[PDB]
Amino acid sequence: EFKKVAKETAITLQSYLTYQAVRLISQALSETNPGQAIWLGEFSKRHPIQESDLYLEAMMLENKELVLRILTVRENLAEGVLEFLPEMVLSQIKQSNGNHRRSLLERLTQ
Amino acid sequence: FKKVAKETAITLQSYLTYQAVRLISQALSETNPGQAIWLGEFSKRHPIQESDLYLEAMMLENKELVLRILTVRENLAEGVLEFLPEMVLSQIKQSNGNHRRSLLERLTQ
């Protein structure tokens, strides 16, 4: 029952999947149309993918076709990845937690 | 879809840690301002986006806080992870529609 945190994490996740889409598409383009990939690279320097909506809106001024392609790719990733995440993250934290704990307590002894 | 899932899972891990620290600091600033102010200074010196290093770093300075972060992040992790796929997937669809409509309008305008 921490909504503020759920909200901010969801929003973060949204932008991250957006970035994750741009990553895939960038690789694709680095093969197919290099000149366009160079553009995408430097575009992403001028605009933080962290504000994905501001990023996408900004892109509309330059390459509408890509925006659309991003919107699609991002949603597919979302479908493919989202459901596996809770189990995945929870046990990662658990394992990480254990290792830090056992490590920190060993330092006290040693 | 596997590589993405792992990278996302790591980020989310890293992120929830941050989010924990944040929540802890909010309380610390209400309670032990000296500690909170130190926490601030520390965060600047060590990048939270690197939790595992960020934590090991802090193990050399405030073991008691490290252990608290670990407990706190896991509480959030359990309270939040579950409602995440519905929220994000829905949130994307919604942003997706707006963006499409906006864009397709601009095209003819």
Cα–Cα distance for residue pair A31/B15, rounded to 1 Å: 32
Q: Please tell me if residue B57 touches chain A, with a CB cutoff of 8 Å.
A: no
B17's CB contacts (< 8 A; 6+ apart) are: B48, B51, B54, B55, B69, B73
Element (H, E) at B3: helix B3-31
Whole-angstrom Cα distance, residue B19 to residue A109?
A: 30
Q: Between residues 75 and 104 of chain B, which touch chain A (CB distance below 8 Å)?
A: 76-85, 87-89, 91-93, 95-96, 99-100, 102-103
Report yes or no: B42 and B61 within 8 Å, Cβ to Cβ.
yes
Determine how many CB atoms are found less than 10 A away from the CB of residue A58: 15
CA distance from start to end of chain A:
40
CA distance B7 to A82: 12
**Hey, is the C-beta of B64 within 8 angstroms of any chain A C-beta?**
no
CA–CA separation, A107 and A103 (whole Å) = 6
Determine the residue of chain A that is closest to B6 in CA distance: A88
DSSP-H helix ranges across chain A: 3-32, 34-46, 52-60, 64-81, 85-109
In chain A, residues with a C-beta closer than 8 Å to the C-beta of B67 are 101, 104
CB A78 within 8 A of CB B88: yes
Query: Comparing C-alpha atoms, which of A10, A70, A84, A5 is closest to residue B2?
Result: A84
Q: How far is CA A62 from CA A18, A67, A68, A73, B107, in A?
A: 18, 9, 12, 19, 12
**Which domains are seen in chain B, by residue range?**
1-109 (1.10.1200.210)
